[PDB]
Amino acid sequence: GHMSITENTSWNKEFSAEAVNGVFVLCKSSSKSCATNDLARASKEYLPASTFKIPSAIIGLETGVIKNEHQVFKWDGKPRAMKQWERDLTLRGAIQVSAVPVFQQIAREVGEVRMQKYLKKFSYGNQNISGGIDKFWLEGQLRISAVNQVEFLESLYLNKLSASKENQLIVKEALVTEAAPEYLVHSKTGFSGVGTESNPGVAWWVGWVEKETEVYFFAFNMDIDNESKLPLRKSIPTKIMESEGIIG
């Protein structure tokens, strides 16, 4: 891209408090003005986990696998890994509750050939989908950096991905997580799991904030080996955005 990124070690204060190894990337207006606590980690690539439901939803719409925004994903009554998935869901519903089996079936119907095509068009991380069509974003070799997330979300915000504008808009409405008269957040979490010995998992929070006529893009990730640390994925970025005057 044409990203211009400045390291700002003052942000590390928010991480040391809870002994978190992670990165926050925050861009005002565009990728031409980004800041981070850690330039090295900003460009390091991790498993996307549920953040991948953003490209996946757009690819589902583009291919016709998802017929339109009113598509209902019916639950077959068989056990699913979380109780909050054991129910019929809309597209927004499935994204918001990170309904993995819904997106596993989307991925299967999209198929390897089309999936590869679109991750190339989107410049989505290392674009490596190998090893199983219904789990490459969960435990396979797909990797993306915080910098790449921000660039990808900026394109989405601008309707500049190689997808119809209407498909980008549908997926954006599905990502709205806070709506006030002059404060709108689009965001998505992810969590790969707790990893293995000496190879922690990754937790994500990515999105953008529209406050007045200003827009801020963000991507956070952190190493995680314990599920009780999970809420830090939103609290640390929230604190940093508060200190910048974005939130509150």
Next chain:
Amino acid sequence: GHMSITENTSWNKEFSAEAVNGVFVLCKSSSKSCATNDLARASKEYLPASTFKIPSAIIGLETGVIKNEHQVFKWDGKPRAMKQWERDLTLRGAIQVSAVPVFQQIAREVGEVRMQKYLKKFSYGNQNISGGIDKFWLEGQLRISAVNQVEFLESLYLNKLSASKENQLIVKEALVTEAAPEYLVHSKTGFSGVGTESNPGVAWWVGWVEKETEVYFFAFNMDIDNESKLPLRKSIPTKIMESEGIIG
């Protein structure tokens, strides 16, 4: 259209509690299953006031007067009737804070001819934009019923208005007023003024609620001659919707 509407006089309870003359229309799934406290008033046409900045936004975008969803509406410094308008505004911001001058200006640009044609394509009320190219929906001759509002909003929800799908989606995102996992409200208020004792003005609340995989369309209006009653345009529909198990 094909609306099927049943009168249920029990709802009148939440009106008489407050000495309000008004109507509420509430439809589950589609206009094929609607209910109201008062059939006659449901079809009676009133000034849309700020609820007109839904069709006018679409018209704005369809005509080119609004270039896209990222257009900024620049303030000029000159006073406006309220403080919250004295600032630049996104399309969303202006809808959500209900910036009359922004929309006055949009109407002027679209002009009477284009406005007439589109209000006809949209079957919007009595389609009378007389005596105020920039005032017809606030003081002029334009009238629309609760039933018509509902049918219009369902059209918008389904992307079935005579406008590109993308413009419908742009305006829909601007109407989001509440966003939770599994609960999404799109909505828009209106007021027109306190009028007289003989001829009181009207207050509106219109929109839809997506809950689980269900959708509910609503339109409320009421007679209003005292500004202190203005929040009832929300509390009465809210109480009716709660008792239907909707406000989760």
